[PDB]
């Protein structure tokens, strides 16, 4: 079951071959070409038209580049979004494989990735066919993609309480919740706390230990509640201030209680 491709080398490239014959100068891994299973790996003006066994014959023509843009080492920031360009096409139908498995067949020179997870690392293969004065080969290039970790450039965002004021009926208990969103830090040391503003002083209220309500590659959300057993008349004379801080900065949100 013959297939053709060509491989243009430039600066730091690699190449792979799949057993495209229906799976569940070689057959003899004599040179520096590595086989794992069903997939051979080429570390670079030769050839290497092999076959493996319903047999699959590959007919490769390695041919150095001459005229020449995203390169074969591309980084994806995990948590966030990203995209992997097809080095070749710096559009026809490009077929993407991630470590041998099929990803997309879209007519563009870039696959986009919405939520970069740990498994988005690997070697990606972007195939697209090419016909000339009649001859139909396939162009294969291999791009190695790394899921690199990167600290945020962002202050914590307070999502609750968003309102300046809270109406309360005194003699009844009240719980003010502070939720804030923290972006990734490799040494993550978040600060979230409640403060009181009476006459001109501020002091940290004395309870309780925060907890997470969300922990995903992009967001860590930490909530920390203040509880008053019964809102007294003084509790309208002070302000309660949520304060969050991470290694980029700090944000606060104050809450003034009303009566009704």
């Amino acid at each position, epitope marked *: 079951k013959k297939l053709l491709w060509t491989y243009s080398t430039r600066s730091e490239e690699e190449f792979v071959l799949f057993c495209d014959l229906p799976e569940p100068e070689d057959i003899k891994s004599y040179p520096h070409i590595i086989q794992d299973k069903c997939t051979l790996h080429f570390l670079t003006n030769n050839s290497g038209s092999y076959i493996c066994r319903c047999c699959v014959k590959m007919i490769l023509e390695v041919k150095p580049q001459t005229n020449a843009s995203a390169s074969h080492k591309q980084d994806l920031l995990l948590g966030s979004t990203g995209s992997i360009s097809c080095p070749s096409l710096s559009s026809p139908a490009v077929t993407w494989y991630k470590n041998g498995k099929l990803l997309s067949v879209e007519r563009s020179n870039r696959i986009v990735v919405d939520e970069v997870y740990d498994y988005h690392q690997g070697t990606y293969v972007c195939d697209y066919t090419q016909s000339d004065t009649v001859s139909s080969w396939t162009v294969r290039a291999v791009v190695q993609v790394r899921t690199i970790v990167g600290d945020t450039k962002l202050k914590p965002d307070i999502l609750d309480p968003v309102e300046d004021t809270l109406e309360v009926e005194l003699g009844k208990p009240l719980t003010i919740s502070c939720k804030a969103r923290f972006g*990734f830090e*490799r040494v993550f040391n978040p600060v979230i706390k409640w403060y009181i503003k009476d006459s001109d002083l501020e002091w940290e209220v004395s309870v309780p230990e925060a907890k997470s309500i969300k922990s995903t590659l992009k967001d860590e959300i930490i909530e920390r509640n203040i509880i008053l057993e019964k809102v007294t008349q003084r509790d309208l004379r002070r302000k309660f201030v949520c304060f969050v801080q991470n290694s980029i900065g700090n944000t606060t949100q104050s809450v003034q209680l009303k009566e009704k």
Partner: single-chain antibody
Amino acid sequence: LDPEVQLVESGGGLVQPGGSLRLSCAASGFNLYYSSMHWVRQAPGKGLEWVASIYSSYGYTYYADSVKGRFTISADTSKNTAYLQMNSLRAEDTAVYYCARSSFSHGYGWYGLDYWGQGTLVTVPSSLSASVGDRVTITCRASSAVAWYQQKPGKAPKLLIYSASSLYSGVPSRFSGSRSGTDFTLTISSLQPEDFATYYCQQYGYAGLITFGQGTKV
């Protein structure tokens, strides 16, 4: 330039077999609720072996079976201190005990042991050989995101690579990492005089069991 991470170890000593001994790790620079703290061991001459993990946030603790039953790992988040409580040393426990941090926050993926202590001594790798300028490739066959460490004869391991490809901060661009099915491989492009060391690979998991490599002297 923000206040950064130390790891002090203590409590080691010469103990009789069947006895007990408490080791201590004074963490400095990181919050124990967003970090996993680990005891990794090195019996004199041999390679690195995982001993115990603690995840203070959830209160989870994990042990390598070769120990499981004897040692208790705990942490006091009011002092940022993790202790390894050793009971009934079976005299193979003789080794230097490192504690090392990892980032255990956000989605909880594994980006390596970033920081190690000097290790505290308690008493009860293969070879490559090439030269300055060569390309060297080291393979490792066996779900995790692998990491690569570089130990120099008497110091604690350094992180080179995390998430199997990504290159740790400070680590020169010479190095490379690959997954390739079940056989991960570290590369040094053009070996330099400083790159000679013992090299270890590592896996994580299933749940949380850390597996190190056998070692490679380059």
